[PDB]
Amino acid sequence: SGLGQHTTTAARLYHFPHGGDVIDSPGVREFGLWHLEPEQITQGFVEFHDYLGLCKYRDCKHDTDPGCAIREAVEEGKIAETRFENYHRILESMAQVKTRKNFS
Amino acid sequence: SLSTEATAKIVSEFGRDANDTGSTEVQVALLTAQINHLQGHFAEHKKDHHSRRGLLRMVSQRRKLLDYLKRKDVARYTQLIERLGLRR
Amino acid sequence: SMQDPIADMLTRIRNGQAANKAAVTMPSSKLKVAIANVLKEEGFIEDFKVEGDTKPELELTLKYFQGKAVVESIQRVSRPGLRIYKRKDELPKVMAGLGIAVVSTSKGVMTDRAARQAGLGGEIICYVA
Amino acid sequence: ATVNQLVRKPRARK
RNA sequence: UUAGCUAGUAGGUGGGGUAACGGCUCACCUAGGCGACGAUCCCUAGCUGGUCUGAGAGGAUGACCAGCCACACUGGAACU
RNA sequence: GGCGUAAAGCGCACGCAGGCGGUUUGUUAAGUCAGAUGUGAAAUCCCCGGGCUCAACCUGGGAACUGCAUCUGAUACUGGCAAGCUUGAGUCUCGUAGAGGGGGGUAGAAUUCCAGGUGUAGCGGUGAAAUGCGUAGAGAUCUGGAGGAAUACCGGUGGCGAAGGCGGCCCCCUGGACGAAGACUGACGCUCAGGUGCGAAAGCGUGGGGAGCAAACAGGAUUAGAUACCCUGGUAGUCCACGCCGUAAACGAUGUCGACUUGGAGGUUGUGCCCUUGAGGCGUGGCUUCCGGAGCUAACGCGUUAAGUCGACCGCCUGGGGA
Ligand SMILES: Nc1nc2c(ncn2[C@@H]2O[C@H](COP(=O)(O)OP(=O)(O)NP(=O)(O)O)[C@@H](O)[C@H]2O)c(=O)[nH]1
Ligand SMILES: [Mg+2]
Ligand SMILES: [Mg+2]
Ligand SMILES: [Mg+2]
Ligand SMILES: [Mg+2]
Ligand SMILES: [Mg+2]
Ligand SMILES: [Mg+2]
Ligand SMILES: [Mg+2]
Ligand SMILES: [Mg+2]
Ligand SMILES: [Mg+2]
Ligand SMILES: [Mg+2]
Ligand SMILES: [Mg+2]
Ligand SMILES: [Mg+2]
Ligand SMILES: [Mg+2]
Ligand SMILES: [Mg+2]
Ligand SMILES: [Mg+2]
Numbered sequence: 001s002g003l004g005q006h007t008t009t010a011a012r013l014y015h016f017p018h019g020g021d022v023i024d025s026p027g028v029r030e031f032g033l034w035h036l037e038p039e040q041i042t043q044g045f046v047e048f049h050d051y052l053g054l055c056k057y058r059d060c061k062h063d064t065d066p067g068c069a070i071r072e073a074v075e076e077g078k079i080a081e082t083r084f085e086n087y088h089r090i091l092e093s094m095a096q097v098k099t100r101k102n103f104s
Numbered sequence: 105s106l107s108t109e110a111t112a113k114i115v116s117e118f119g120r121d122a123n124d125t126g127s128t129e130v131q132v133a134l135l136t137a138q139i140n141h142l143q144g145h146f147a148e149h150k151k152d153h154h155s156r157r158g159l160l161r162m163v164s165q166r167r168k169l170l171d172y173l174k175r176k177d178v179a180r181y182t183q184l185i186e187r188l189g190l191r192r
Numbered sequence: 193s194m195q196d197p198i199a200d201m202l203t204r205i206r207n208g209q210a211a212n213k214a215a216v217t218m219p220s221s222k223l224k225v226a227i228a229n230v231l232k233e234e235g236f237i238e239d240f241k242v243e244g245d246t247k248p249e250l251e252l253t254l255k256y257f258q259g260k261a262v263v264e265s266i267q268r269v270s271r272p273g274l275r276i277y278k279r280k281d282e283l284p285k286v287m288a289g290l291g292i293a294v295v296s297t298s299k300g301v302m303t304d305r306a307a308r309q310a311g312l313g314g315e316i317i318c319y320v321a
Numbered sequence: 322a323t324v325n326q327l328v329r330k331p332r333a334r335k
Numbered sequence: 336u337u338a339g340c341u342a343g344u345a346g347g348u349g350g351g352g353u354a355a356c357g358g359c360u361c362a363c364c365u366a367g368g369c370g371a372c373g374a375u376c377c378c379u380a381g382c383u384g385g386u387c388u389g390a391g392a393g394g395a396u397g398a399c400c401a402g403c404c405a406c407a408c409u410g411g412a413a414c415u
Numbered sequence: 416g417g418c419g420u421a422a423a424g425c426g427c428a429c430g431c432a433g434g435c436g437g438u439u440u441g442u443u444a445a446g447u448c449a450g451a452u453g454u455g456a457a458a459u460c461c462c463c464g465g466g467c468u469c470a471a472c473c474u475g476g477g478a479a480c481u482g483c484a485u486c487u488g489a490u491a492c493u494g495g496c497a498a499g500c501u502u503g504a505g506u507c508u509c510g511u512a513g514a515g516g517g518g519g520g521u522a523g524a525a526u527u528c529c530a531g532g533u534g535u536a537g538c539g540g541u542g543a544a545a546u547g548c549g550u551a552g553a554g555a556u557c558u559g560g561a562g563g564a565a566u567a568c569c570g571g572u573g574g575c576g577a578a579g580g581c582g583g584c585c586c587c588c589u590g591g592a593c594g595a596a597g598a599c600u601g602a603c604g605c606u607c608a609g610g611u612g613c614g615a616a617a618g619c620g621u622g623g624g625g626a627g628c629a630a631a632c633a634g635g636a637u638u639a640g641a642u643a644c645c646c647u648g649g650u651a652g653u654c655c656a657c658g659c660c661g662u663a664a665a666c667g668a669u670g671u672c673g674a675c676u677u678g679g680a681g682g683u684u685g686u687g688c689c690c691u692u693g694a695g696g697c698g699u700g701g702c703u704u705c706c707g708g709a710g711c712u713a714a715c716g717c718g719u720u721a722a723g724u725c726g727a728c729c730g731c732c733u734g735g736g737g738a
């Protein structure tokens with residue numbers, strides 16, 4: 001009605017007419033962020049690399065901390081606010097996935 | 105079942121005296137007049153299946169009482185079946 | 193209902209023997225007298241009396257050892273659902289000859305020990321163990 | 322359990 | 336997870352028939368017969384005295400021995 | 416051998432065939448029992464022997480073949496006939512209690528809709544918000560009317576009914592249950608495969624009906640997505656008539672009937688007697704819950720309403736999955 005179905009299975013291999021291979025993917029709605037620290041979440045975005053080391057404190061949550069230069073870059077308009085509100089949504093997702101426990 | 109005038113009269117009709125009230129032929133007539141009393145009731149009240157259980161109780165009770173007189177004395181049996189209009 | 197009154201008789205004996213009752217009562221009949229008189233002559237009970245003629249009521253006096261059950265267990269064998277009959281040489285013993293088996297024949301009610309001199313067979317009533 | 326039941330149908334051997 | 340089956344079918348008369356009784360057969364007359372105590376239909380199988388197992392009750396089976404029935408390439412028929 | 420929870424008591428009831436049946440006497444000798452005759456081929460097996468050097472094996476006689484038929488007997492029990500008896504089961508009268516069923520009226524709150532009045536910026540909703548509604552005056556309040564469905568308190572392991580179930584009041588028709596005192600029929604009984612009817616709700620057919628609630632669905636949050644949860648609405652259905660469907664964790668997860676076996680806390684419903692010397696004292700039946708002895712049970716627990724000891728009959732189960 002308003003959704004999508006995952007009919008094709010995990011991965012089937014074929015070849016390009018020129019070169020290389022293809023890998024199909026499942027219909028995936030999962031987000032596994034159990035890997036590393038939220039310092040690596042800062043490294044997961046390209047334009048946020050060049051703006052680090054510009055805020056007030058040496059450690060920063062970037063949501064409730066006064067004087068965040070990353071937040072000033074969003075207010076300037078060089079970074080869209082759709083990416084910034086989704087960025088702390090990732091950080092607030094780790095406040096709710098972490099709850100029970102999981103370790104490899 | 106019935107009133108006092110309807111019950112005590114039929115005992116005097118089929119019994120030898122006023123004390124002849126426990127006999128089987130009186131007990132058939134107590135059920136015969138009651139089923140004939142309930143002919144117009146269940147015609148109007150076909151959705152009353154709970155009183156129908158009391159109706160089917162008395163039909164099965166009358167059938168058991170006719171089988172006792174039939175197996176013992178058939179002379180008194182052939183009198184009552186036409187005197188009350190039985191055997192259909 | 194009361195369709196096996198001998199089994200109803202054995203029910204009242206086994207209960208009062210275990211429940212330390214001194215005496216029991218039951219409705220009498222001709223056959224219940226012909227069994228309790230045998231048990232009186234075989235040391236299992238003490239005495240029996242009749243009461244009433246239009247309602248025959250039989251009574252039994254119990255029997256104990258030091259408050260211990262003399263009749264330890266009794267087993268109804270034949271029944272209205274299944275009749276059991278044996279011959280003069282197929283009479284079963286109770287506890288290899290210790291207990292007695294009440295067998296009613298044409299010469300009255302007797303035991304299998306008494307049926308050896310009688311040489312008859314018939315209906316097994318109960319295993320008086 | 323009843324002997325009179327087994328008159329109608331005996332015990333079903335597998 | 337087979338409930339109705341059956342018209343020579345059930346019975347009777349008379350004729351015919353075989354070594355013997357009989358729907359065994361024929362004409363006529365009757366509408367009964369069978370069946371929930373398993374008729375009928377389907378599948379499987381020779382049976383029994385026995386063998387084997389089992390404390391016994393039972394259970395499984397029917398080779399060699401013996402008894403009986405059926406069969407002799409398939410089907411049908413009669414003679415002697 | 417089992418069926419309260421391991422697999423299993425049909426959802427319940429009526430009832431034919433069938434099985435079974437109180438007590439007393441007479442009769443029959445059917446069943447059964449005793450004895451005898453005939454028969455149950457031989458071989459096999461069993462008992463004692465003999466023979467082959469032994470054993471296997473062969474073989475003498477006996478036993479066995481628990482079978483069937485007939486005859487003579489015995490009469491306690493079962494069966495049949497005959498006459499009974501009353502404690503089983505029924506009948507009458509006087510009564511009591513009950514949401515038992517069906518039909519027809521009727522009441523007042525509450526919900527929503529509509530009409531009018533006063534009255535103003537939010538109402539509504541949630542963890543927080545939004546959808547939605549409202550300056551055409553919502554919401555709130557008051558008056559009045561319409562329609563629909565259900566009956567607060569009473570009300571409680573309380574009552575009734577075979578069960579599912581059944582709840583405002585009143586009338587009418589009607590069913591069963593129980594108690595008291597006697598009278599009366601005389602086993603008229605118990606049980607049930609097929610058969611018969613009842614049987615929660617959903618759903619189906621035809622025609623009505625429409626508040627509220629509410630599958631599907633609409634919309635908004637939630638979310639990775641929301642299909643569900645939450646919220647604002649909303650059709651079928653829920654209501655009635657007429658049928659059909661006959662399945663439920665239809666459960667007390669215990670089929671019915673009868674007989675007995677120490678008892679308590681109570682509840683409900685009667686009845687008998689008693690300085691009525693209080694709605695009390697003393698008994699005594701019907702129904703019902705919680706404890707608990709013996710006993711039983713795999714344990715849990717049951718335990719005078721048994722799952723204790725027994726009888727009568729019926730249903731059902733045979734490793735799990737497939738199913
Ligand atoms: N109109 C249109 N339809 C398209 C286009 N691309 C794909 N579709 C349709 O979209 C549907 C989904 O395609 P599909 O490739 O099966 O999706 P998927 O992501 O592989 N599904 P899955 O998760 O099962 O593997 C198909 O019906 C396809 O025809 C396009 O460019 N235009
Ligand atoms: Mg009444
Ligand atoms: Mg002829
Ligand atoms: Mg040969
Ligand atoms: Mg041969
Ligand atoms: Mg077992
Ligand atoms: Mg189970
Ligand atoms: Mg039930
Ligand atoms: Mg004589
Ligand atoms: Mg022989
Ligand atoms: Mg010999
Ligand atoms: Mg020999
Ligand atoms: Mg030797
Ligand atoms: Mg007799
Ligand atoms: Mg109202
Ligand atoms: Mg009399």
Ligand SMILES: [Mg+2]
Pocket residue numbers: 619
């Ligand atoms: Mg429809």
Ligand SMILES: [Mg+2]
Pocket residue numbers: none
């Ligand atoms: Mg909804």
Ligand SMILES: [Mg+2]
Pocket residue numbers: none
């Ligand atoms: Mg409808």
Ligand SMILES: [Mg+2]
Pocket residue numbers: none
């Ligand atoms: Mg079912």
Ligand SMILES: [Mg+2]
Pocket residue numbers: none
């Ligand atoms: Mg329970």
Ligand SMILES: [Mg+2]
Pocket residue numbers: 708
């Ligand atoms: Mg104890």
Ligand SMILES: [Mg+2]
Pocket residue numbers: 707718
């Ligand atoms: Mg208890």
Ligand SMILES: [Mg+2]
Pocket residue numbers: none
């Ligand atoms: Mg199986």
Ligand SMILES: [Zn+2]
Pocket residue numbers: 055056060061062065067068069070071
């Ligand atoms: Zn910062």
